Structure formats: C-alpha cells, structure tokens
C-alpha cells in the first residue's frame, strides 16, 4: 500500500515525522557532494569538478582514469592523480557528523557511501554502520589472484608521493587501492545488506550524489513505497520503487532541499533542536583530530 506518512512535503514535515514514534530506522545514501566542503572535488561540478580537470593526464577521455581495464593497461595517470589529490588532512564535514549523531541517537540503520575518503569511519561510524559501495583507499591489494598481498595506506602513500608505481614486493603484480573501479564488481556486503536493510527502513536520506552511478542509484527504488525520501543536494537528482517524484500531482513522499549538504543538515538539526549538540560534536571531534 502506497501510504502517506509525511504530513507535508517539506523539511519541517520530515522533521515532525522524524519526531514520530514510527521513525526508528534511517538509511543514508551519500556521494561526493558531502565531502566537497572537506576540499575533495566531486566529478560532475563545473570548472571545479574532476571531469573538467583531467585533460592534462592525456587520457582517451576523462572517465578512463577510473576504468578498471584502462587502469590495468596503464595505472600511471591514476597514481599521479592520487598524488595531486591526496589531502593534507582527513577532517569530516558537518554532514558527516550529522550521521554520527543519528548513530548516537539510535536512528542509524546504515550509511551506504560511494565515497572512498574514509571520512565516515573517521567521523565515528563503525564498520557495521557502513556499506562502502565503491570500496576504500585505506587498504590496497596486489592484483595477482593467487597472492593478494595486502599493503597499508602508508606503503601506498610512500609510493604515490615517490612517483613509483606500486608493485607487490613478492610477486611483482601491480598494487591497486581497494577501490571499485568502473567495470568492477561491487562488494558482497552491498547486495546482502540491501536485502536485509530496506525491509526495516522508515526514512531514506540522500545527500550529495547525482545518482548516475549504478547499481547504487537504484537503491532508492528498493525502499518500501511508503518510505519517505529526503534529498539534500545542490541540484535535484533521482528523477529519470520508482525514481524521485518531487513536484507532480502524484507526489506523496519525496522532498528535495536544494543547497549545501552542510546547510541542510544544520537546518534539520535545528528543527529537531539538535543544532547545539551537532555544533559541539563537530568542534570536539575536529579538535581531537587537530590534536594528532
């Protein structure tokens, strides 16, 4: 049954609903827009986006650098790019901490993330809270099936800053971050968690993704038809379970809030009377990081 649980298709609606006794189980879906404030570029933004900033790596086209088969025949563009992009400091955003607070308030069933920056773990989400849908830069493995030597971040970082292409110390096979390059299979966990999680979901909260990457994007339509969906994004996504209907005669459960993910989270914090708690969480945790 396509029931209605939002009183109004606004963020105040979503907040009241969040305050209802029914809303106990939240899933976050996130992408690259939630980390743009931490100085990590997204792909799709103009001038700043990565797809407008690769020309100087002499690729067949921009996308190729993140393609498993191109990376295999020529891994050098990628690792030179990794050195250009490698952050001076890994400091999660407000958006990140807004999900930490959900976890703390008992409301977070799962965060499904497309990012590889590890900011979620850093912000305090345990492994069990997370499905890293495009993998992680944190660990790396050699590509030989029969070897699969793990290597640490530091080893991988050494190599990157050295401009030495990582080779397994044992078998000499190329060493790849545990990222899921385009053309790769998504991790086992993704499909298994998606089977369990979407049958308990009271609210979908979608932030800083253009929802063009599959099969992450389709997660939206795995939600029960009655489950309200909030997007917090600069631009509307999810349109082309069913895609996001925000604005037509039939709209009943979807909201778009258009602006910065940081701004959105603070606004929702505010409606819940969370603003101070969230402000204090960011500060305490930011300083703990600066303390190292």
């Amino acid at each position: 049954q396509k029931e209605r649980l939002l009183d109004e298709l606004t963020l105040e609606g979503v907040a009241r609903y969040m305050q209802s006794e029914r809303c106990r189980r939240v899933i976050c879906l996130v992408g690259a827009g939630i980390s743009t404030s931490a100085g990590i570029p997204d792909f799709r933004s103009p001038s700043t986006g990565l797809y407008d900033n690769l020309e100087k790596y002499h690729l067949p086209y921009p996308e190729a650098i993140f393609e498993i088969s191109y990376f295999k025949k020529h891994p050098e563009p990628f690792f030179a790019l990794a050195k250009e992009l490698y952050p001076g400091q890994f400091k999660p955003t407000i958006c990140h901490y807004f999900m930490r607070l959900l976890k703390d308030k008992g409301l977070l069933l799962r965060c499904y993330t497309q990012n590889i920056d590890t900011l979620e773990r850093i912000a305090g989400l345990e492994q069990e809270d997370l499905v890293e849908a495009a993998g992680t830069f944190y660990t790396s493995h050699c590509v030989s099936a029969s070897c699969r030597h793990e290597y640490p971040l530091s080893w991988m970082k050494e190599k990157i800053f050295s401009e030495v292409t990582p080779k397994c110390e044992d078998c000499q096979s190329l060493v790849k971050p545990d990222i899921v390059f385009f053309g790769e299979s998504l991790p086992a966990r993704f499909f298994s968690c998606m089977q369990s999680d979407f049958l308990k979901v009271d609210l979908l909260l979608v932030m800083g993704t253009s929802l063009q990457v599959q099969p992450f994007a389709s997660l939206i339509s795995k939600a029960p038809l009655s489950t309200p969906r909030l997007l917090i994004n600069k631009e509307k996504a999810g349109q082309s379970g069913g895609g996001m209907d925000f604005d037509s005669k039939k709209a009943y459960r979807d909201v778009a809030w258009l602006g910065e993910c940081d701004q959105g989270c603070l606004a929702l914090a505010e409606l819940l009377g969370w603003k101070k708690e969230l402000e204090d969480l960011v500060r305490r945790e930011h300083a703990s990081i600066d303390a190292q």
């Binding site: 996308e63 495009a134 899921v180 390059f181 385009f182 053309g183 790769e184 299979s185 998504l186 991790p187 086992a188 499909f191 063009q212 990457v213 599959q214 099969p215």
Partner: peptide, 6 residues
Amino acid sequence: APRKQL
C-alpha cells in the same frame, strides 16, 4: 556480482 558503471 553486478558491476560499477555510469
């Protein structure tokens, strides 16, 4: 396992 693609 289905596959990362644009």
